[PDB]
Structure formats: C-alpha cells, structure tokens
C-alpha cells in the first residue's frame, strides 16, 4: 500500500488514488446546485458559517471570471481560489490576444487542462475542489463542472457536495426547456433549504448568482431581496 502517496503513480488496477482522495474532500464539503435555463444560468451554494461574527460576504464561493462568466468553488476554498485566478488569466488572454469574450466551452476546457496537470507530477497534489462554470458568451448559456481529475462535462442541471444525492433527485423534477432564471432562483433555493442538515451545521447562509438576459449578460450575485 505504498501506491497511494504520490499522484505520479498508477495502482495495479489502473486507478490514481491521490485523485480519488481529493475527490473525497469535495464530497464532504458544502452542497451547491446549478441550472442552465432558457435565458441564462443560475448557481446557488450553501455557505456553512464557522462563527456568528463573520461579516457578510466572507468566504464567498462564487467569483466572477469575466464580464460574462463566473465560477462556484465546491470543496476546499483556497484551492478553488487558485483555479479562479487561472480562469481570469484565460478570460483576459482571450480578450487580449483574440479580441473575443472567451466561449464557455473553451474556458471550461482550459480549467480542466489546468486541474489535470496537478494530477501528473510527483511534486504537486491534485486540487481539492470542483469548479462549476457558468457562462453566457456568444455560444449561449452554458454550465460546466471541472473536477480534481480534470474531467469536464456540460450539464443542464447539477449538484455537488454532501447533499448531492437528494438535490439530484429534486433537480430531476424540473423542466429544462421552459424554466427561466427567475423561477430557478426560487426552486434551487428551496432545494438547498431541504437538503440542509440541522443537527450538524447550525449556521449557514445561501449565496446565489446568475448570468441572464435580465442582467444584460453580466455575471453577478443576485440582489439580496429575492430569496
């Protein structure tokens, strides 16, 4: 059992255990849900509060990466943050070098590539976050997840973290051809309030952002009067 100490090593079954373990961080972190709608994308996360004396806006999991794109970090927050800075450099690169807002599929590709590389060198470790990518550039509304392996997949709706198996069951009852950004903000908030465990995490708040036709395709936290 020396085969699980570096991520530069296959196990005998063809697994990379350092990457499995990092995925376990994510699966024990807080629950986030997202929905790709007709007019945009909505993300909602649940912040577990470590203290009643935090200012509001502390330990934000949702960050803007470009005028039209944002990420929600699920898993370890500072790991997630290093991923946010790369995502911004990519987004900036695309405007600087190619004169275009980055497409959502391309930004997700580049984030994956980035997370993948810390899965191959003895000297580094995998990231301990998944990153939800929400975009609305010339390719329309897109929602991608990258994970610690560097796998990237597009979604209509999704849920990560500890609540994720129930949240997934409720996200299945939505209708993704009709639903708008306004309806989703309501429904996703209801799902985070129901999968919340009250025994274990007494202090929480919800964070919620969006990029829609309302917001003039700008990624932004939703105005706090809509929960």
């Amino acid at each position: 059992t020396e085969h699980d100490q570096s991520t530069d090593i296959f196990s005998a079954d063809g697994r990379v255990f350092q990457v499995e373990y990092a995925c376990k961080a994510v699966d024990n972190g807080s629950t986030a849900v997202a929905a790709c709608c007709t007019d945009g994308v909505v993300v909602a996360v649940e912040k577990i509060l470590t203290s009643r004396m935090l200012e509001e806006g502390s330990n934000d999991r949702i960050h803007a990466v470009d005028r039209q794109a944002g990420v929600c970090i699920c898993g370890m927050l500072p790991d997630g943050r290093a991923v946010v800075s790369r995502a911004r450099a990519e987004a900036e690169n695309s405007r600087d070098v190619f004169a275009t807002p980055i497409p959502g599929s391309v930004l997700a590709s580049r984030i994956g590539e980035f997370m993948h590389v810390y899965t191959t060198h003895y000297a580094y470790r995998p990231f301990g976050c998944s990153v939800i990518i929400a975009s609305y550039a010339d390719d329309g509304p897109q929602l991608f997840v990258s994970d610690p392996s560097g796998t990237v997949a597009g979604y209509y709706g999704i849920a990560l973290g500890k609540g994720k198996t129930v949240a997934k069951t409720e996200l299945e009852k939505l209708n993704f051809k009709s639903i708008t950004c306004d309806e989703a903000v309501v429904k996703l908030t209801k799902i985070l309030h129901d999968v919340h465990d009250k025994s274990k995490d007494k202090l929480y708040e919800l964070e919620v952002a969006w990029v829609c036709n309302k917001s003039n395709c700008v990624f932004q936290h939703v105005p706090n009067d809509m929960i």
Binding site: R67, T100, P101, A137, D138, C217, V218
Partner: protein
Amino acid sequence: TTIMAVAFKGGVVLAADSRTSTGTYVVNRASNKLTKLAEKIYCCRSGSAADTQALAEQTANYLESYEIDTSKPVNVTTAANIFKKLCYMNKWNISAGIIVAGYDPLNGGSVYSIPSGGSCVKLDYALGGSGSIFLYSFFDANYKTGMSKEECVCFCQRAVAHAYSRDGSSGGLIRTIALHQGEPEDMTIPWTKTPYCMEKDPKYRDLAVQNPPFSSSAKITVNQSRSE
C-alpha cells in the same frame, strides 16, 4: 499648394487653393497664387513663395518691355520661354513649379508646365504643387476635351476642392481666372461654399467603430458614448 490650368476652346482657366504654410501651421490663409504676367498671360505659382514671386516679377518686367518695343500683345510661348530660362538657370538655388497659361490671337489658349529642374512642356492641362498627386486619377477619370468656359471653371473648382480636402498643405479659398479673347474673369469661392469636402460628404458622416463598449459578445455595433 494645388495649382492647375486647363485649355478650352478659345482660352484657358487657371485655378488655385489659397494656403501658404510652414509645414504644419498656416501663415497665410488667403494667398494669391494666380499671378499676372501680361494682360492675358498668368502663371500659377507653387513652391517657395519668395522664389516664385521674384521670378514672376522678373518675367513680367521683361514682357512689358518687349510689348512696348514690338508694339504688339505678347504670345504665350514667349512668356513661357522667358520664365523657363529663369527656372533653368537657377535650378539649384530655388524650389519652384510653375504653370504659364494665357490667351493670344495667334495660337489661342495655351498651357505650359514648367516643373522643378526647368523643363517646359506644352499641354492641354497641367497640374502642380503638393496637391497635384491627388488629381491625376481625377482628371484621367473625369476630364474631357471640348469643355466650354463654364464647364471648365466649374470642373477646376471641383478638382481643387478634391485636392485640398485630402492634402494637409492646401486649403482655404478657391481662386480661378478665365482668359480668352474677351475680358479676364476672376472668381473666388469661400471654403463655406466649396463644392466638395469630406466634412459634408455623407459617406463620412457616421464614425468608425473604434471604441466599442466592454461587452459580453464579440459583436460590434456602436461606439460607446457615455460612461457606464
């Protein structure tokens, strides 16, 4: 400068812009580049104003003497040759490009170009000055033989205006003069009645989209006009 002369049946027209410049700054905005050499012979001056004023004055002095001796009006070719020789003898010491044109009863309207270096060429039209290089194609495309006096004045005014709208070193008034068997006719058009400028041409009204707003699309539409 933009100068030119054009022959028509019976006469010539001479045209010029009105600007004198140091390169970047206009020292006179109302010069008169159509200089009289005899009753029906004029020249259009380009280059150093000091040089072309001195050579025109000198050419005029000689022709007035010659007309008193002969007792006859002087032919254009004589004006042109006197000038040419002055332009050739001093070629290394001056910057001058000249057009001599005129009317005389023996040969009608005639036009001579006398460019830098002092050659002398007898033509149906002549262009000169910095602004000339914008009019070759104009004339190739739009000029015709057989034009009347009135067509030719108008055409000259429109050529000068095309030249001076693109040449930084030309501008101001458009002066013309028409020389023929009758009395000399001069005309001055102010910049506010110019027949062409880019400021009033409708294909340059709408501005290039150099300053689009920060947007979530690669689509280009309008210049940003107000802060966000």
